[PDB]
Design a protein around this ligand. Structure first.
Ligand SMILES: NC(=O)C1=CN([C@@H]2O[C@H](COP(=O)(O)OP(=O)(O)OC[C@H]3O[C@@H](n4cnc5c(N)ncnc54)[C@H](OP(=O)(O)O)[C@@H]3O)[C@@H](O)[C@H]2O)C=CC1
Ligand SMILES: COc1cc(Cc2cnc(N)nc2N)cc(OC)c1OC
Length: 171
């Protein structure tokens, strides 16, 4: 199973304000949808509440501690680990937020697909700081504003150590 975090953030890693997105960025919404269709998506309960309904054409998984919580059109699990355990056969599970889920998922994540907006918004929740020594950039695409803020799509893949790593060429 590949664990992938997808998130949109500003230059300070801000992702949210009052349980809403701090911006409207159509390019990001198109990107997110095209990436997530036909994959299982995992979100925390507040993010589901923010979205307000299941995202169509995808398996919506919601994490909550509330044992008797019912959400039509979503699968409920009582921990991220329980969800990941149930999805063992999936080639890729996409974690879609929010801040609490991202923080918990990051130590298990293999991949990150990040939209980074070149602007500073006002807000209350952030994407977790990742260790730049642990991850390599596999794709970076910068976009000028039109989408009224400039933005980039940055893809990262988790590494494996210079001391122990294999090498591409040998004499
Ligand atoms: N910019 C972006 O890409 C994104 C932004 N957002 C933003 O993030 C914010 C929401 O994030 P946040 O408030 O952190 O909430 P989350 O979306 O991470 O949901 C938190 C809730 O999820 C449940 N939960 C999380 N982890 C566990 C666990 N390990 N075991 C059991 N239950 C768990 C709990 O539900 P319960 O209370 O029911 O027990 C908890 O209150 C919003 O502002 C939203 O707009 C969200 C996604 C992406
Ligand atoms: C498709 O609509 C929404 C999607 C998301 C999650 C999300 C959106 N974009 C990116 N790049 N990563 C994510 N995890 C979060 C939302 O609100 C918190 C949405 O409602 C506007």
């Amino acid at each position: 199973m590949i664990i992938t975090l997808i998130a949109a953030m500003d230059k300070n890693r801000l992702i949210g304000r009052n349980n809403e997105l701090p911006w409207h960025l159509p390019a990001d919404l198109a990107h997110f949808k095209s990436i997530t269709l036909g994959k299982p998506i995992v979100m925390g309960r507040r993010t589901f509440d923010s979205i307000g309904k299941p995202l169509p054409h995808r398996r919506n998984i919601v994490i909550t501690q509330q044992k008797n919580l019912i959400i039509e059109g979503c699968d409920i699990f009582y921990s991220l680990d329980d969800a990941l355990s149930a999805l063992t056969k999936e080639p890729e599970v996409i974690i879609i937020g929010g801040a609490r889920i991202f923080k918990e998922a990051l130590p298990k994540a293999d991949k990150m697909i990040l939209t980074i907006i070149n602007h500073s918004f006002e807000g209350d929740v952030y994407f977790p700081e990742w260790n730049d020594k642990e991850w390599k950039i596999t794709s970076q695409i910068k976009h000028e504003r039109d989408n009224p803020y400039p933005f980039q799509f940055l893809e990262l893949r988790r590494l494996e150590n210079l001391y122990f790593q294999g090498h591409h060429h040998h004499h």
